[PDB]
């Protein structure tokens, strides 16, 4: 599930503004569609007021390109370091950057490769 | 519990704050030792999910049986455990769709 409609998103934002942040059970008792963990994940993913959902620049693209090679896995560790902190915009930006840019005898051999 | 989770928090912020890894040269030697050992034994690489496999459905039934036998035993619940049991039952009802879901997740969702 978890379609995350706009009328549910406004109700979740009102519940986060009214009830609190560290009370996930109190916010899940006024929606009748998701659980407390799903509501907390939505509040930390899309309903967070500090999430930069737009303005993808070249400095952040160069920061993410110079970080995916140092750590290939663990995209959640590079979520708050890059500045996106959405845990899904980083993978989407990596997919966009990958799609747009696509469009003993062995040693003895190399030893004689330099001597020849 | 609160103390040891705080301890893991401090160690994790440390091991990312300093980048103090496992001594890159010794790391490279370890990776090379592993590559050489595996080649000497000549192990084949493990194939990714064979989509029409004879192995597939039989393996999925075995794993779901273990997951059911653990997560449900006798007459307890939650709401999270309820959704877990429900998805388990749906998998045991429409197995090929579940294998499709698993394959799509394992090849897609790296989060």
């Amino acid at each position: 599930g978890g379609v995350w409609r706009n009328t549910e998103d406004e109700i979740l934002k009102a519940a986060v503004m009214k009830y609190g942040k560290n009370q996930w059970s109190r916010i899940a008792s006024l929606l009748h569609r998701k659980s407390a963990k799903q509501c907390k994940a939505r509040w930390y993913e899309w309903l967070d007021p500090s999430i930069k959902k737009t303005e993808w620049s070249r400095e952040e693209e160069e920061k993410l390109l110079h970080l995916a090679k140092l750590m290939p896995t663990q995209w959640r560790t590079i979520a708050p370091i890059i500045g996106r902190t959405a845990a899904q915009c980083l993978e989407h930006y990596e997919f966009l950057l990958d799609k747009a840019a696509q469009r003993d005898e062995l040693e003895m051999l190399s030893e004689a490769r330099a001597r020849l | 519990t609160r103390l040891y989770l705080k301890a893991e928090q401090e160690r994790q912020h440390n091991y990312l704050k300093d980048g103090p890894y496992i001594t890159a040269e010794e790391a490279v030697a370890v990776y090379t030792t592993t590559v050489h050992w595996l080649e000497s034994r000549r192990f084949s690489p493990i194939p990714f999910p064979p989509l029409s496999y004879k192995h597939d459905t039989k393996l999925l039934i075995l794993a779901l049986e273990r997951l059911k036998e653990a997560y449900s035993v006798k007459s307890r619940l939650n709401q999270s455990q309820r959704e877990e049991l429900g998805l388990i039952e749906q998998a045991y009802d429409n197995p090929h769709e579940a294998l499709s879901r698993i394959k799509r997740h394992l090849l897609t969702q790296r989060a």
Partner: peptide, 28 residues
Amino acid sequence: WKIPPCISNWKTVHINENFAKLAEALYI
């Protein structure tokens, strides 16, 4: 010397060059 309100309760550089130098060495 005034006490402000208190509603909070529920009721370095973060990068190191050694990790990148280890990752590039592992890639090489």
